[PDB]
């Protein structure tokens, strides 16, 4: 409660030093023997929720994934092995665009270039043109946009959030995203939340976050 | 007569806001003008510019004054207030809310906080 | 490895997105009925949205092009209250005048020098599609046509008011030319008076001479919300009913937003509609032609209706002829099937009365300042008399319109209600609260060191819950270290002798503290990523600051 | 100090804004640390690139310093002025 | 365990307590 907040000379060198190899040793050896089987069982149970997410994606809702643990493998598996093949072969070749937001050098111009090249026969004006174009176009899905770390350093910025928020207006684009920060829902105001149209699910999985920590070294301590 | 009694240089319930937003804006003013010393006693410089504070203080005071936990609507209303610029931050370009360096301050005068307190039946007048 | 790249692309029965109930043709029937009703609703939804968008542009064009007798030259000012960057405007193609839409975002206005340059750049680009004030001066001698400029200030509340105030005075010099006309559009999120505080009173007097004020919010007197809700009542056709609980949830979750309430309402209604057909098997009997689909499980579910219990117990407690009760007890001849068919035959005048009260208020009484959802919930509860008594004129027609709802047996199978919290966890999550609970109550997620050693993040949150606002990192490391079962850790470690480095590290006497510190470092980095903690690394890695607390 | 009778305007805070704007331009006031006219073009470039806090904070809370001290006012202001008696503390 | 994870995960497959359980009619049938 709020009372728990209102009521609340040593050095790091006093602890033994750690080398770069030793830091990787524990992270590699423990994670393969610790909680592997129960997390595999939890994953096998959670895989039963794919039809509901698929239906929501059909009905035009964006999906946001949150919870404790890494959220790479779940999103990648859903996008590749389950979502795109069904989108293609149940309607009868869907580009599975994966964006790594935890990279602090993900230029928005480069991602917009790929999107424009893969969807089109002052970026905001071009996105508006695309939105006006695809309104009369058939509603079948073309692109899956997996946005890892929608709270990542390259992604937190206002301009990139504004760029992403307009993309969900186009029905033929499927948006899947995950966040880690506790105050992640602070990023989105009325307009951005309206355009995103997220449906929120708790995917707390205790998967060891290793890829996200790879980009920014932990050996600083 | 009434032409000569008012300047009429003005360009034109003044704010119609959600209840959560109203209480958030009450708590933010409390954060901005109450010294940090009193947070452990009262809840358990008007003429000067408002002091800075942290979101950790705002959430605690909001929880302590609303007649709520941490559902997304609270943060959505807070971000709406920032977009409305009823609350200011310590930056100008490339807003990076989640970065720890950013600090928050109130951009609303007392005359509006008083009316908000009246509309939500709150008693900010007794905390100072 | 592929994750090193910033972004990359990957390329690859006929699954109808529905799934079986009760552990083939029925699923297709249910999907087809659902999709029919769903498309019927979205047709009206899109029609209403397009009507809303078309409504504003007529007034906008009227304000822009309503010429007024003025010999003096001044800006044409339009105040779009409650507006947003998503709006659009198109311009008339007049005979002698050339019209250009000049958009001005706050990103495009760091100073007057950039503003004038970019305005002239856009003007020249439009003119050549068919960098200073000389271009405006020489525009007619270049292109032979008069110039009319519409400066659209896309977001006033974020623009540095000093730069805008000076740029308006800069544009004020342009009125020396007889061939130029200027119009300014202001997008304001807050009240109008928020601008008056920041601009200088010299500029306000320039703006005030010719200005127009317009509200473009979607919450204009419940009009469109009432229309959309009544369209939802129409598109159901009485095939499904809305309980008081679901209306209560809607009323509780609507008031927290004040700009785009229509979108939230549509989202909630669509989510409920798509949940109902996935959940309830009796949604197939929206089409009664499939009456032969009645089976054992449908009979069981019908027997599970509380209204059935009330009816049967009412018969029993009256000592009604035991043959009727024995017929269901012995399950013979299943006349309850025809009973349920007659139940399906029943009509609900609730919808008709709900529509007619609104129509009477709008047309006979001209009372448009009301909420249709509040009216519907008052009709559901029966307190309609007081709700109509909110207005003075509604006494005699209030007495006439008095309506009493009557339940039907097995109505629970054709009613949407909030009863298990699924509609709340999915649209209004307790994000931070959920994270806190999962860290503290990880048994809510997870199903021999695995059995004792909780997840490292939860174990660290245990200490995070109690410690001081600013934490000495050495003390925090000590507290984390003291929780380690060293002997059980050694037993866990020694299961993999195939890696030599594992034994080399583990058998070192410092290995316990080293592993504790490595796990501490990883957990603290994860906490920083989640926003849980912040280093004082600018000073030293000896102290860390807490940035979140439980419950609040 | 004017006795009440048995059976001077305080101008509104909004109207005083024009008076404040007039006085800020006539250099009677000055912003807390206003460097004013820069010396060279490079200094002007760095000044125009930066955004001062005093230009962002509300009109009611901008900090100012005074150019004419009250003693100079009492020297200059005629004693026939009604407000002259307040030229002392 | 299945019901708790189904409700926390927001799945629509979780039983909704508008209809009383079949086990309740294992009791009510004797009445």
Coordinates of C-alpha atoms in Angstrom, one line a residue, chain C residues 63-482:
Chain C
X63 CA -16.5 28.1 -42.4
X64 CA -13.5 28.1 -44.7
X65 CA -15.4 29.5 -47.8
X66 CA -18.1 31.6 -46.3
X67 CA -16.9 35.0 -47.7
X68 CA -17.8 37.9 -45.4
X69 CA -17.9 41.6 -46.2
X70 CA -14.6 42.9 -44.9
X71 CA -12.4 45.6 -46.5
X72 CA -9.5 44.9 -44.1
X73 CA -7.2 41.9 -44.4
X74 CA -6.8 39.4 -41.5
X75 CA -6.4 35.7 -40.9
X76 CA -9.3 33.3 -41.0
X77 CA -9.1 31.5 -37.7
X78 CA -10.9 28.2 -36.9
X79 CA -10.7 26.6 -33.4
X80 CA -11.1 22.8 -33.5
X81 CA -11.8 22.0 -29.8
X82 CA -11.3 18.4 -28.8
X83 CA -9.6 17.7 -32.1
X84 CA -6.7 15.4 -33.0
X85 CA -4.0 14.9 -35.6
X86 CA -6.2 12.2 -37.3
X87 CA -8.6 14.6 -39.0
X88 CA -8.4 15.5 -42.7
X89 CA -9.5 18.5 -44.8
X90 CA -9.8 18.9 -48.5
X91 CA -9.9 22.2 -50.4
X92 CA -12.0 23.7 -53.2
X93 CA -10.5 24.1 -56.7
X94 CA -11.6 27.6 -57.4
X95 CA -11.1 29.4 -60.7
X96 CA -8.7 32.3 -60.1
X97 CA -7.2 31.2 -56.8
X98 CA -4.6 28.5 -56.2
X99 CA -5.2 26.6 -52.9
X100 CA -2.5 24.9 -50.9
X101 CA -2.8 23.0 -47.6
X102 CA 0.1 23.9 -45.4
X103 CA 0.5 21.4 -42.5
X104 CA 2.6 22.6 -39.5
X105 CA 3.4 20.0 -36.8
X106 CA 5.3 21.0 -33.7
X107 CA 8.3 19.0 -35.0
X108 CA 8.3 21.4 -38.0
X109 CA 8.5 24.5 -35.9
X110 CA 11.7 24.8 -33.8
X111 CA 12.1 28.5 -34.8
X112 CA 10.7 31.1 -37.2
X113 CA 13.7 30.5 -39.5
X114 CA 12.7 26.9 -40.1
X115 CA 9.0 27.7 -40.2
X116 CA 9.2 30.2 -43.0
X117 CA 11.6 28.0 -45.0
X118 CA 9.4 24.9 -44.7
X119 CA 6.2 26.9 -45.5
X120 CA 7.8 28.3 -48.6
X121 CA 9.1 24.8 -49.5
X122 CA 5.7 23.3 -49.3
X123 CA 4.1 26.2 -51.2
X124 CA 6.7 25.9 -54.0
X125 CA 6.3 22.1 -54.2
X126 CA 2.5 22.5 -54.6
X127 CA 2.9 25.3 -57.1
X128 CA 5.3 23.2 -59.2
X129 CA 3.0 20.2 -58.9
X130 CA 0.2 22.4 -60.3
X131 CA 12.3 30.0 -49.9
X132 CA 11.1 33.2 -48.2
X133 CA 8.4 35.8 -48.4
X134 CA 9.6 37.0 -51.8
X135 CA 8.0 33.8 -53.1
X136 CA 4.7 35.0 -51.8
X137 CA 5.4 38.5 -53.2
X138 CA 6.3 37.2 -56.6
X139 CA 3.8 34.3 -56.7
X140 CA 1.3 35.9 -59.2
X141 CA 4.1 37.1 -61.5
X142 CA 5.4 33.5 -61.6
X143 CA 2.2 31.4 -61.8
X144 CA -0.4 33.9 -62.9
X145 CA -2.8 32.9 -60.2
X146 CA -3.9 34.2 -56.8
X147 CA -2.7 32.4 -53.7
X148 CA -4.8 31.2 -50.7
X149 CA -2.9 29.6 -47.8
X150 CA -4.4 27.3 -45.2
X151 CA -2.0 26.9 -42.3
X152 CA -3.1 23.8 -40.3
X153 CA -1.6 23.8 -36.8
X154 CA -1.8 20.1 -36.1
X155 CA -1.2 20.3 -32.4
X156 CA -1.1 23.6 -30.6
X157 CA -0.6 22.3 -27.1
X158 CA 2.9 21.0 -28.0
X159 CA 4.2 24.0 -30.0
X160 CA 6.6 26.5 -28.4
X161 CA 4.2 29.4 -28.1
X162 CA 7.0 31.9 -28.4
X163 CA 7.9 30.7 -31.9
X164 CA 4.3 30.5 -33.0
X165 CA 3.6 34.0 -31.6
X166 CA 6.5 35.5 -33.5
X167 CA 5.7 33.5 -36.7
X168 CA 2.1 34.9 -36.6
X169 CA 3.5 38.4 -36.5
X170 CA 5.9 37.5 -39.4
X171 CA 2.9 36.3 -41.5
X172 CA 1.1 39.5 -40.5
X173 CA 3.4 41.4 -42.9
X174 CA 2.1 39.3 -45.9
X175 CA -1.2 41.3 -45.9
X176 CA 0.6 44.1 -47.8
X177 CA 0.0 42.0 -51.0
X178 CA -3.4 42.2 -52.7
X179 CA -3.2 38.7 -54.2
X180 CA -2.7 36.6 -50.9
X181 CA -5.2 35.3 -48.4
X182 CA -4.4 33.3 -45.3
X183 CA -6.4 31.0 -43.0
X184 CA -5.3 29.4 -39.8
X185 CA -6.6 26.2 -38.3
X186 CA -5.9 25.5 -34.6
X187 CA -6.2 22.0 -33.1
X188 CA -6.7 22.2 -29.3
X189 CA -7.0 19.2 -27.0
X190 CA -7.6 21.2 -23.8
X191 CA -10.0 24.1 -23.3
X192 CA -9.7 27.2 -25.5
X193 CA -8.4 29.3 -22.6
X194 CA -5.2 27.3 -22.3
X195 CA -3.9 29.1 -25.4
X196 CA -4.7 32.5 -23.9
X197 CA -2.3 32.0 -21.0
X198 CA 0.7 31.3 -23.3
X199 CA 0.4 33.6 -26.2
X200 CA 1.0 37.3 -25.9
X201 CA -2.1 39.5 -25.8
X202 CA -0.9 41.3 -28.9
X203 CA -1.4 38.1 -30.9
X204 CA -4.7 37.2 -29.3
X205 CA -6.1 40.6 -30.6
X206 CA -4.9 39.7 -34.1
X207 CA -6.6 36.3 -33.9
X208 CA -9.8 37.6 -32.3
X209 CA -10.8 39.9 -35.2
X210 CA -11.9 37.0 -37.4
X211 CA -12.2 33.6 -35.7
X212 CA -14.6 30.7 -35.5
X213 CA -15.1 28.1 -32.8
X214 CA -16.1 24.4 -33.4
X215 CA -16.4 21.3 -31.3
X216 CA -15.5 18.1 -33.0
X217 CA -15.5 15.7 -30.1
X218 CA -17.3 12.3 -30.4
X219 CA -19.1 12.8 -27.0
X220 CA -21.3 15.6 -28.3
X221 CA -24.5 15.1 -26.2
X222 CA -24.6 11.3 -26.4
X223 CA -26.1 11.6 -29.9
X224 CA -23.8 9.2 -31.7
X225 CA -23.3 7.0 -28.7
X226 CA -27.1 6.6 -28.3
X227 CA -27.4 5.9 -32.1
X228 CA -24.7 3.2 -32.0
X229 CA -26.1 1.6 -28.9
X230 CA -29.6 1.5 -30.5
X231 CA -28.0 0.1 -33.7
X232 CA -26.6 -2.7 -31.5
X233 CA -30.0 -3.3 -30.0
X234 CA -31.4 -3.5 -33.6
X235 CA -28.7 -5.8 -35.0
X236 CA -29.3 -8.5 -32.3
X237 CA -33.0 -8.9 -33.2
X238 CA -33.8 -10.3 -29.8
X239 CA -31.7 -13.3 -30.6
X240 CA -29.6 -12.6 -27.6
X241 CA -30.1 -10.6 -24.4
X242 CA -27.9 -8.2 -22.4
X243 CA -27.9 -8.7 -18.6
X244 CA -27.8 -5.9 -16.0
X245 CA -24.3 -7.0 -15.0
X246 CA -22.8 -6.5 -18.4
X247 CA -24.5 -3.1 -18.8
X248 CA -23.1 -2.2 -15.3
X249 CA -19.6 -3.2 -16.5
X250 CA -20.1 -1.0 -19.6
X251 CA -21.2 1.9 -17.5
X252 CA -18.3 1.5 -15.2
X253 CA -15.6 1.2 -17.9
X254 CA -17.0 3.9 -20.3
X255 CA -16.8 7.0 -18.0
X256 CA -13.0 6.7 -17.6
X257 CA -12.4 7.9 -21.2
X258 CA -13.6 11.2 -22.5
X259 CA -12.4 11.5 -26.2
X260 CA -13.0 8.3 -28.1
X261 CA -15.8 6.6 -26.0
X262 CA -17.4 5.3 -29.2
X263 CA -14.4 3.2 -30.1
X264 CA -14.3 1.7 -26.6
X265 CA -18.0 1.0 -26.7
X266 CA -17.7 -0.7 -30.1
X267 CA -14.7 -2.7 -28.8
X268 CA -16.5 -4.0 -25.8
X269 CA -19.7 -4.9 -27.7
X270 CA -17.7 -6.7 -30.4
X271 CA -15.6 -8.6 -27.8
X272 CA -18.8 -9.7 -26.0
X273 CA -20.4 -10.8 -29.3
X274 CA -17.4 -12.8 -30.3
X275 CA -17.0 -14.4 -26.9
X276 CA -20.7 -15.5 -26.7
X277 CA -20.6 -17.6 -29.9
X278 CA -17.3 -19.2 -28.9
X279 CA -18.6 -20.0 -25.4
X280 CA -22.3 -20.9 -25.6
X281 CA -23.4 -24.0 -27.6
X282 CA -27.1 -22.8 -27.6
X283 CA -26.1 -19.9 -29.9
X284 CA -26.8 -22.5 -32.7
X285 CA -30.5 -22.3 -31.8
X286 CA -30.6 -18.7 -32.8
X287 CA -31.8 -20.4 -36.0
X288 CA -34.6 -22.7 -34.8
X289 CA -34.7 -24.7 -38.1
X290 CA -31.9 -26.8 -36.6
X291 CA -34.3 -28.0 -33.8
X292 CA -33.3 -31.6 -34.6
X293 CA -29.8 -30.8 -33.2
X294 CA -31.1 -31.2 -29.7
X295 CA -29.0 -33.9 -27.9
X296 CA -28.2 -35.2 -24.4
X297 CA -25.7 -32.5 -23.5
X298 CA -28.1 -29.7 -24.5
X299 CA -30.7 -31.3 -22.3
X300 CA -28.2 -31.5 -19.4
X301 CA -27.3 -27.8 -19.9
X302 CA -31.0 -26.9 -20.0
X303 CA -31.4 -28.8 -16.7
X304 CA -28.6 -26.7 -15.3
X305 CA -30.5 -23.5 -15.8
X306 CA -31.5 -22.0 -12.4
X307 CA -34.9 -20.9 -13.9
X308 CA -35.6 -24.6 -14.5
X309 CA -34.8 -25.3 -10.8
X310 CA -37.2 -22.5 -9.8
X311 CA -40.0 -23.9 -12.1
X312 CA -39.6 -27.5 -11.0
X313 CA -39.4 -26.6 -7.3
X314 CA -42.5 -24.4 -7.7
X315 CA -44.3 -27.3 -9.1
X316 CA -43.1 -29.7 -6.4
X317 CA -43.8 -27.4 -3.4
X318 CA -47.4 -26.9 -4.6
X319 CA -47.7 -30.7 -4.8
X320 CA -48.6 -30.6 -8.5
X321 CA -49.6 -33.8 -10.3
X322 CA -46.5 -36.0 -9.9
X323 CA -46.8 -37.3 -13.5
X324 CA -45.3 -34.1 -14.9
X325 CA -42.4 -34.2 -12.5
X326 CA -41.8 -37.9 -13.1
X327 CA -41.7 -37.3 -16.8
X328 CA -38.6 -35.2 -16.4
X329 CA -37.2 -37.4 -13.6
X330 CA -37.6 -40.6 -15.8
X331 CA -36.6 -38.5 -18.8
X332 CA -39.4 -40.0 -21.0
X333 CA -40.8 -38.7 -24.3
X334 CA -38.9 -35.4 -23.7
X335 CA -41.8 -33.0 -24.0
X336 CA -39.3 -30.4 -22.6
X337 CA -38.0 -30.2 -26.2
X338 CA -41.3 -28.7 -27.4
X339 CA -41.4 -26.7 -24.2
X340 CA -38.1 -25.2 -25.1
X341 CA -39.3 -24.6 -28.7
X342 CA -42.2 -22.6 -27.3
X343 CA -39.7 -20.7 -25.1
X344 CA -37.8 -19.9 -28.3
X345 CA -41.2 -18.7 -29.8
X346 CA -41.4 -16.0 -27.0
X347 CA -41.1 -12.3 -27.8
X348 CA -39.3 -9.7 -25.8
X349 CA -41.1 -6.3 -25.9
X350 CA -38.2 -5.0 -23.7
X351 CA -36.3 -3.9 -26.9
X352 CA -39.4 -2.4 -28.4
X353 CA -40.2 -0.3 -25.3
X354 CA -36.5 0.7 -25.0
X355 CA -36.6 2.0 -28.5
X356 CA -40.0 3.6 -28.2
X357 CA -39.1 5.6 -25.0
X358 CA -36.1 7.1 -26.7
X359 CA -38.2 7.9 -29.8
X360 CA -40.9 9.5 -27.6
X361 CA -38.3 11.6 -25.8
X362 CA -36.7 12.8 -29.0
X363 CA -39.8 13.4 -31.1
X364 CA -42.8 14.0 -28.7
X365 CA -40.9 15.6 -25.8
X366 CA -37.7 16.8 -27.7
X367 CA -35.6 15.7 -24.7
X368 CA -32.3 14.8 -26.3
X369 CA -30.0 15.4 -23.3
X370 CA -30.0 11.8 -22.0
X371 CA -28.0 8.6 -22.1
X372 CA -29.5 5.6 -23.8
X373 CA -27.4 3.1 -21.8
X374 CA -28.7 4.6 -18.5
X375 CA -32.3 4.4 -19.9
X376 CA -31.7 0.8 -20.9
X377 CA -30.3 -0.1 -17.5
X378 CA -33.2 1.6 -15.7
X379 CA -35.6 -0.4 -17.8
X380 CA -33.7 -3.5 -16.9
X381 CA -33.9 -2.7 -13.2
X382 CA -37.4 -1.2 -13.3
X383 CA -36.5 2.1 -11.7
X384 CA -37.6 3.8 -15.0
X385 CA -40.0 6.0 -13.1
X386 CA -37.3 7.9 -11.2
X387 CA -35.1 8.2 -14.3
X388 CA -38.0 9.8 -16.2
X389 CA -38.7 11.9 -13.1
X390 CA -35.3 13.4 -13.6
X391 CA -37.1 15.6 -16.2
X392 CA -40.2 17.6 -15.3
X393 CA -42.3 17.0 -18.4
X394 CA -42.2 13.1 -18.0
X395 CA -45.1 12.5 -15.6
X396 CA -48.1 11.4 -17.7
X397 CA -46.1 9.8 -20.5
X398 CA -43.8 8.3 -17.8
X399 CA -46.9 6.6 -16.3
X400 CA -47.9 5.5 -19.8
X401 CA -44.5 4.1 -20.7
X402 CA -44.1 2.2 -17.4
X403 CA -42.8 -1.2 -18.4
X404 CA -42.2 -4.4 -16.4
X405 CA -39.7 -7.1 -17.6
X406 CA -40.6 -10.7 -17.1
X407 CA -38.0 -13.5 -17.2
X408 CA -38.2 -16.7 -19.2
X409 CA -37.0 -20.3 -18.5
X410 CA -33.5 -21.1 -19.8
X411 CA -32.9 -17.3 -20.5
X412 CA -29.5 -17.8 -18.8
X413 CA -28.4 -19.6 -22.0
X414 CA -29.2 -16.5 -24.1
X415 CA -27.9 -13.7 -21.9
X416 CA -24.5 -12.0 -21.9
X417 CA -23.2 -11.3 -18.4
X418 CA -20.0 -10.5 -16.6
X419 CA -19.7 -13.4 -14.2
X420 CA -16.1 -14.7 -14.3
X421 CA -14.0 -11.6 -15.0
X422 CA -12.8 -12.7 -18.4
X423 CA -14.1 -9.5 -20.0
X424 CA -12.1 -7.5 -17.5
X425 CA -8.7 -9.3 -17.5
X426 CA -8.6 -9.1 -21.3
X427 CA -9.5 -5.4 -21.9
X428 CA -8.7 -3.7 -18.6
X429 CA -5.8 -5.7 -17.1
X430 CA -4.2 -5.2 -13.7
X431 CA -0.9 -5.1 -15.4
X432 CA 1.4 -3.9 -12.6
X433 CA -0.8 -5.7 -10.0
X434 CA -0.7 -8.9 -12.0
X435 CA 3.1 -8.6 -12.2
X436 CA 3.4 -8.1 -8.5
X437 CA 1.1 -11.0 -7.7
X438 CA 2.9 -13.3 -10.1
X439 CA 6.2 -12.4 -8.6
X440 CA 4.9 -13.0 -5.1
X441 CA 2.5 -15.9 -5.9
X442 CA 4.3 -17.7 -8.7
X443 CA 2.3 -20.8 -7.9
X444 CA -0.5 -19.0 -9.8
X445 CA 1.5 -19.6 -13.0
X446 CA 3.9 -22.5 -12.5
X447 CA 2.4 -26.1 -12.2
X448 CA 15.0 -31.4 -7.1
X449 CA 16.1 -27.8 -6.6
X450 CA 13.3 -26.8 -9.0
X451 CA 10.8 -27.7 -6.2
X452 CA 12.4 -25.3 -3.6
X453 CA 14.2 -22.5 -5.4
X454 CA 11.5 -20.1 -6.5
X455 CA 12.2 -17.9 -9.6
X456 CA 15.1 -15.6 -9.1
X457 CA 13.1 -12.5 -9.8
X458 CA 10.4 -13.4 -7.3
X459 CA 13.0 -14.2 -4.7
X460 CA 14.6 -10.8 -5.3
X461 CA 11.2 -9.1 -5.1
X462 CA 10.8 -10.7 -1.7
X463 CA 13.7 -8.5 -0.5
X464 CA 12.6 -5.6 -2.7
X465 CA 9.3 -5.5 -0.8
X466 CA 10.8 -4.6 2.5
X467 CA 14.1 -2.7 2.0
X468 CA 14.8 1.0 2.1
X469 CA 14.0 3.5 -0.7
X470 CA 17.8 3.8 -1.5
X471 CA 19.6 0.4 -1.1
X472 CA 23.2 -0.2 -0.5
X473 CA 24.0 -2.8 -3.2
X474 CA 26.4 -4.7 -1.0
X475 CA 23.7 -5.2 1.7
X476 CA 21.1 -6.2 -1.0
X477 CA 23.6 -8.8 -2.4
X478 CA 24.2 -10.1 1.2
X479 CA 20.5 -10.5 1.7
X480 CA 20.1 -12.3 -1.7
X481 CA 23.1 -14.5 -0.9
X482 CA 21.8 -15.7 2.5

